[PDB]
């Protein structure tokens, strides 16, 4: 058919969108134990029975967890069984034959979902599909229990029956590239911004201050963030898999943790630095030298490395559950599986402690500003808005993740992986947000204008 363009009209992709790939046994909207791609194991409330049926179907001891290959095999087996079920039935086949490829895919979808007999139960709907009355069949199918139990999927399939096209499912492909370009813009913004900052601090001599040393550290963390973590992550997300190996997977993960930790902790160091610089400027200028600041930076990077590369490369961060073992064994898998200890410890070190210290410090600033040797001016309002942005951005970017990161481990996930990755990236854009917050000094402005000759 000379069709090698993305998204070909078929039953497989339709069902992948409707069901969704999951390797571990889960419960559907009804409550039955499902696995893979909409593969019903048993109607038995016992999970052990589901494991028995699963092991019987696959052909080995799966422990409730299967691989991608087995999932696809089960998928094709169930689709083929659905088709054969349609051809074997006396109510489905006369309808199935008098249907175009798309509507055929819709019928195969229904049979795939609720079995042969159940779909054969739709006397009126099939009687209308056979007479090519798509709208009446749509309205009628919109009055079933199937539409009441799974309204969204029912709406999509019914729409597919009505229009006869793939308009109900074609709206996803556009979303894929639609977020792809966003990822591109993210990488570009981060890299450009941080390279600009680092170059500005490095080249000019008027920007050689301790605060700007901390800014240099932060900008380096965000730079390695935008050059390594973000692009490889984008490639991992878009291509649905991982094509670099387990070693580079755990290495990329190490860079992830290291960069995030270093970034946040450096933000904390900046907060404290500015507190001492504003509250007690003379002691700040006398005590904190460039060497002391360098030692501080070294300490931050060491602590960051101790919570990233060390546990990860020593497999200490690794989990014990079956899916984690499979993913660690799988070369194409690079999902983020950890145990309670590592998740909690890393969350505390990387995010929570710097969060607490920063909140306390800025609160100390706002508090001590009101007890100086002094008319409700507007400068204090502007400063309050400034710190509101400084802390507000950081919070809004990294708080949703580390909370979820601590919730996703305390109990087996009711939190979708989509949300996990999404919030992780909401944390990722903070690296690009930082140069627009910590580099608004007049010297930084002039430097930025001179660097690109605007």
């Amino acid at each position: 058919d000379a069709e090698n363009l993305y998204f070909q009209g078929n039953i497989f992709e339709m069902l992948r969108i409707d069901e969704g790939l999951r390797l571990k046994i889960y419960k559907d909207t009804e409550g039955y134990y499902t696995i893979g791609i909409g593969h019903l194991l048993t109607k038995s409330p016992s999970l052990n029975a589901a494991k028995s049926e699963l092991d019987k179907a696959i052909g080995r001891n799966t422990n409730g967890v299967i691989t991608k290959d087995e999932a696809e095999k089960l998928f094709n087996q169930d689709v083929d069984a659905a088709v054969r079920g349609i051809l074997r039935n006396a109510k489905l086949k006369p309808v199935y034959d008098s249907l175009d490829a798309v509507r055929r895919a819709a019928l195969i979808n229904m049979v795939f979902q609720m079995g042969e007999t159940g779909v054969a139960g739709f006397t009126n709907s099939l009687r209308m599909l056979q007479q090519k009355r798509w709208d009446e069949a749509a309205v009628n199918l919109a009055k079933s229990r199937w539409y009441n139990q799974t309204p969204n999927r029912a709406k999509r399939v019914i729409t597919t029956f009505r229009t006869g096209t793939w308009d109900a499912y074609a709206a996803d492909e556009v979303w894929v590239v639609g977020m792809g370009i966003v990822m591109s813009l993210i990488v570009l913004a981060i890299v450009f911004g941080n390279v600009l900052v680092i170059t500005a601090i490095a080249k000019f001599e008027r920007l050689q201050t301790v605060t700007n040393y901390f800014i240099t550290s932060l900008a380096c963390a965000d730079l390695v963030m935008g050059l390594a973590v973000v692009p490889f992550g984008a490639a991992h997300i878009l291509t649905k898999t991982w094509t670099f190996g387990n070693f580079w997977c755990e290495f990329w993960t190490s860079i992830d943790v290291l960069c995030v930790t270093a970034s946040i902790e450096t933000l904390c160091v900046i907060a404290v630095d500015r507190y001492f610089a504003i509250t007690s400027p003379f002691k700040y200028q006398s005590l904190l030298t460039k060497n002391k600041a360098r030692v501080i930076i070294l300490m931050v990077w060491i602590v960051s490395g101790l919570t990233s590369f060390l546990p990860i490369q020593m497999h200490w961060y690794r989990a014990t559950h079956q899916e984690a073992i499979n993913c660690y064994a799988e070369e194409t898998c690079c999902d983020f599986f950890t145990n309670q200890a590592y998740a909690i410890a890393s969350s505390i070190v990387s995010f929570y402690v710097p969060l607490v210290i920063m909140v306390f410090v800025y609160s100390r600033v706002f508090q001590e500003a009101k007890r100086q040797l002094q008319k409700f001016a507007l400068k204090e309002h502007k400063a309050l808005k400034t710190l509101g942005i400084i802390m507000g951005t950081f919070t809004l970017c990294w708080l949703p993740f580390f909370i979820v990161n601590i919730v996703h481990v305390i109990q087996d996930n009711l939190i979708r992986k989509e949300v996990y990755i999404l919030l992780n990236w909401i944390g990722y854009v903070n690296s690009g947000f930082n140069p627009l917050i910590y580099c608004r000094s007049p010297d930084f402005r002039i430097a930025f204008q001179e660097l690109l000759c605007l």
Partner: nanobody
Framework: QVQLQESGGGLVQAGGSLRLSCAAS????????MGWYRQAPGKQRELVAA???????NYANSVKGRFTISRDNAANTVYLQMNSLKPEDTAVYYC??????????????WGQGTQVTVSS
């Protein structure tokens, strides 16, 4: 968009006393460093004496023990007491305000500058 009114400078005999003064007209952030800098004939701009909004002060190594900086209570006015003046103190004195309203960095406000001449 605030202003700095400097006053007090002038000619003075060697060993005589002089009183500088800077008045900050406008809205300045509560946390600031109000001080005095100077430019000697053929020398770079040097810090004379700065005072923080928290009362604490800071003097140069050539004025410590001779110069004493203080500030007003509510009008944000800084007075610089210059006792036992020397011919090397003959310079151009600028009033200065380090504002911390940006928290991350500091906004600088400068005065028009006053001339001080010590008769050698």
């Amino acid at each position: 968009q605030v202003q700095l009114q400097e006053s007090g400078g002038g000619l003075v005999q060697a060993g005589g006393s002089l009183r500088l003064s800077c008045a900050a007209s406008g809205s300045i952030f509560a946390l600031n460093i109000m001080g005095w800098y100077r430019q000697a004939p053929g020398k770079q701009r040097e810090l004379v004496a700065a005072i923080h909004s928290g009362g604490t002060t800071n003097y140069a190594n050539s004025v410590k023990g001779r110069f004493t900086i203080s500030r007003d209570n509510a009008a944000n006015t800084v007075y610089l007491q210059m006792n036992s003046l020397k011919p090397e103190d003959t310079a151009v004195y600028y009033c200065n305000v380090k504002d911390f309203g940006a928290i991350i960095y500091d906004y600088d406000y400068w005065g028009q500058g006053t001339q001080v001449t010590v008769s050698s």
